[PDB]
Amino acid sequence: VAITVQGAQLIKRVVERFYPGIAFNINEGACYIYKFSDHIRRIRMKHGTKYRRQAEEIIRNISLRKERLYGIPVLDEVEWKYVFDGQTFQSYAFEVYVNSILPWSELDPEEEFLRNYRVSREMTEVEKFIEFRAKNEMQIYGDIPIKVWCCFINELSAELKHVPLGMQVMADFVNRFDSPFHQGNRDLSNLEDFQVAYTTPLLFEMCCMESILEFNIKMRMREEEISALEFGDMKVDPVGLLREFFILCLPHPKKINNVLRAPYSWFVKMWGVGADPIVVLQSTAGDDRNSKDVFYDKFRTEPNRYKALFRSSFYNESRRMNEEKILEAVKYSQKLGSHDRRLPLFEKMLKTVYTTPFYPHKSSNMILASFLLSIQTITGYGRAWVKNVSTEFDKQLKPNPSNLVQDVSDLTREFFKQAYVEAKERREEIVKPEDLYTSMLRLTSSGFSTEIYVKKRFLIKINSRIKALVIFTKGHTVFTDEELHKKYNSVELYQTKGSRDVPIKATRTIYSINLSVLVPQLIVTLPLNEYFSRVGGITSPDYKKIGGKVIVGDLEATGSRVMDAADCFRNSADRDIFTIAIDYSEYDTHLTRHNFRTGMLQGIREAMAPYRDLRYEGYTLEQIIDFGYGEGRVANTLWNGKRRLFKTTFDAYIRLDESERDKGSFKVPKGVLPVSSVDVANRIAVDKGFDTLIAATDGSDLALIDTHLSGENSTLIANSMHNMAIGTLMQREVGREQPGVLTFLSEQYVGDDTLFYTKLHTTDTKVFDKVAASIFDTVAKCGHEASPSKTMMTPYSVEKTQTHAKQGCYVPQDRMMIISSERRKDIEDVQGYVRSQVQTMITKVSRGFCHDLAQLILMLKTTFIGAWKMKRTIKEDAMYRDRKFDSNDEDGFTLIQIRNPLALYVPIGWNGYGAHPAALNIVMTEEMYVDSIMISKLDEIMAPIRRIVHDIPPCWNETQGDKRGLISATKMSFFSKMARPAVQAALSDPQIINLVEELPLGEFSPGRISRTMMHSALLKESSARTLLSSGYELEYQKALNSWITQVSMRLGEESGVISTSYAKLFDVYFEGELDGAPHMFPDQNLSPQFYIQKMMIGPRVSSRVRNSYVDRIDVILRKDVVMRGFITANTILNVIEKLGTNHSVGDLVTVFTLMNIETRVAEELAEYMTSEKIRFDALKLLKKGIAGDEFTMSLNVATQDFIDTYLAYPYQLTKTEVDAISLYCTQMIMLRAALGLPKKKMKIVVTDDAKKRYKIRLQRFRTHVPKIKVLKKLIDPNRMTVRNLENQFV
């Protein structure tokens, strides 16, 4: 019944399956195994070495398992054919997959997603091109080998007495084809040796993800004591839905899945909006429809006013096209793969989408709705082949008296002109010529490069292109006459397009832009970014200001999706609101010069009118717009990317002249042959009977682009303002054509997304049809086009930025994939990565995932993350030491370290990871462990942990933090003209340097600030870290040697730093009953562990929380973007503690400006510290990550109301002590709610006994007046919090 023992047994079985014959005991911290490979020995033979073993090592251990190195046995992995215990099935899905395998003669060179091509023993250029495509598109990456995933799936399937379909498919494949591929355990990006097809790793990933989905849905349905999901009242099987969706995608997974994304989400959005009686959760907030001050009370059922409106033509067309897309997907699947199967259940469900009721208060419906949104993660990342297509000029829409292109242009100009006035009203302006070089730090790679020298210290060269390093070295070479006038629209001058993987969709295009183009854009677009940065405002159309309409900051402002999208739930709960959400297709492509660009440039130029007297290095502002958005800079640039390929024949290729086969300046893929030009490639290329691929090499394959680019400095702002112009014309036209039908209450624009909150004053279908037709016609006449099959126009349903709300409740979606990743992961610090993985699991469980399954996944991960990281250390005679360079014993052997699964529940500081078995959102610290083992209700759960809590070896961390000794020889040549006027004035004379050397500025003084910035920029680079961390394994060996298997808890953390362990200074007792009425929250579909926490503790209804000194100082310092990455709150606190309590605000301002902080941030810091002078206790609070996760931020904890209603503490404490006590109380109340303990009040109790009071006084004196600060003369006796200590607890 305890999760700990069952999880430990399961992971032990998984380990025993992966390594046969291993002895993995659950009563020890780790197990050490040796691995043998013969790669290094045969290459050492090239230098003349000899061994007595020859090839007896393999036969000694593969079947006999007798290879022991110094008493530690040698083992090997289990081969693929025995992963599934030799089981076999007759799965039809495997037949469907093997039928869909294509030969090489049906290749398409520029295919979007690769189909299933064969593997042949022969090797022509065609199969070589297939291989080159597969090596960089079938990658799994991740953090765990896929064979471990298969073994875990097998063990879990055995344990649950349930067999998933993907497991059947993999078993059937391996029972006849054996090893599909080989993957490196030390480096997961080494995939090779495809056997049957080039898409086998994708097949295995898809099967594993489907198995995980079936396990999750089965466990989640088991938690609620239900046997099947319901569509209204009709019973459905989620396993059947998942299997029918999984089988259909086998011939072409990525393409079919990307096709079928839209209809499923459309069905989920549209379900239940037409039922005559409807169920909603009441909500209440302010007058504005975007208000976040929402509280919820209860459920009810009311008649539907819009019942008769769903027989209109618009809804019929939406349903018809949504059906037709599914029909085409089914036809394509039945054609590519020899089968006649379809999706009967979803087709039957979709026919009655409008009128079938939806029940937010029933788990059987909410779980189904959430499940239909998450089955799209089976195919993994959408890695694809993106080809270059030029801008097709001759069909863009031109202004015309029958169009509205001139109108959107003029409105964009007007909005851009108004934005500058609104930004100036907030005292935010463009950069002045005095700030030109300073502002360049607000702008990782670039189009430039540099060479620098570094010195090893316990004289090498490296090449770097990072923006920080290239700026620091040659910032003066950017803003020059020769660099500004260059035109990148030729064969000798161009840029290159990048690619980034995304979880499901196709690969995103990245437009890297030179720094000399980015600087002029920044110069005139920084105030717009700063003005639109802040959150909040009025979104009423009658309101004059436009700062509230742009909602670019509204999302992700608070670390919780539920709190930041409460207006969605409120508006979906209301019966008076009709919601219109409109999405555009190819939004960026439609931003031509006729409708977008010229209006924007004209508006910027007209807004720059008052600043005509400025001169930026002799240049006017008009020239700055020309340099930033000019002809050869943005408008008509030529871009390089992926090559264009043609199919041809070899005989015609050799019959071609040698000149046409010249190898030009542009590289070509492996399997293609070089051709001089595009036209000569076109002349010979043929379709049928192809055996050769060719590509041009001279540079006529480049694409010319005249279209808004995603890499510009003001992309999002310009996109949102253009959307605002489109919405303005939409409102005007619908008001003109159908007066009095729709009234607009709210308008929101965040880019290409538009949202409206309106009231509808009609029920006749004809009027609604006319209104919808007018809206679509207005959108079409502006140069854009909106697909009617994705446009949302309905009540009781709101969707804004991947957040769904139906009838006042939260419908989450889980797209957090855990098996793969976009790029290769290097684990420099294991502990931080595991911490972040626990964070991700918390987010997933908050999205509707199963809590116990997440704990099992984490227990599986925690054992195998750190393995195979040791290749040089040899464990001989219980000693960890470096291997000898050449021997018959230690050559060709590596040590494998496998950690105990229970290390997930060992507090950070005892070499474990801070997770609590009661709930994943509770962090286990040391005093948390002590409190848990003092609770009698947790005895069975914590019993296995107590055995191994002291026996966890230290973790691998090559980024230990105190990295010093990589002193650079090259010097920063840019600091002279970038520094702020205080630093320049200080450097102007040496006597000022001598006087400021008395100041406690220390590391950030103007005499040594440049080296600090230079080193902080150098260590930011990756390859420099790899070079610096080359010899870390010696330090790790020393750490293992010095380890002692003892743990102990301390009250004080360091000198001047305290933590939640400070709460153990007093006794804690719970007493006093509180309210027992359960609270209402909009986010249903939670595991019982989270549900009880949200039932006993209500949702957060207070806007703000309590903050510490460090948090406030950090938030203030976040304003200074230039100095953000260098000065932390710790440095500022040290500076203000090295100053006395007798200081003036002006002195603080001037010293902060001397430390190169901007003047406004210095004033903020000075006024904050002057306000808190009496209450400042000069202590630092160390949070271990308490209440910082996604789910906990949605609870009514860490607030003043929580402290008032749950905590009673002595009045003598200072602010930081109260912060520590409050964190302790929050975590303890969360634990008590999770464990089912009665709701009580925490009371800090101190009796009248003299001995305990003397002990408390002594500990408080030690913490507030440490000895080390007394010896260094660093304590101010006149501080109020020090004078108070005389008579506190006498």
């Binding site: 003397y1254 006084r1257 002594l1258 004196f1261 007046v1265 007394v1270 003369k1273 304590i1275 006796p1277 006149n1278 020090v1282 004078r1283 200590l1285 005389e1286």
Partner: peptide, 15 residues
């Protein structure tokens, strides 16, 4: 050792 007084602290550190 014994708990210090805040008045003696300034006497000590003034030296």
């Amino acid at each position: 050792g014994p708990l210090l007084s805040v008045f003696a602290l300034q006497e000590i550190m003034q030296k």
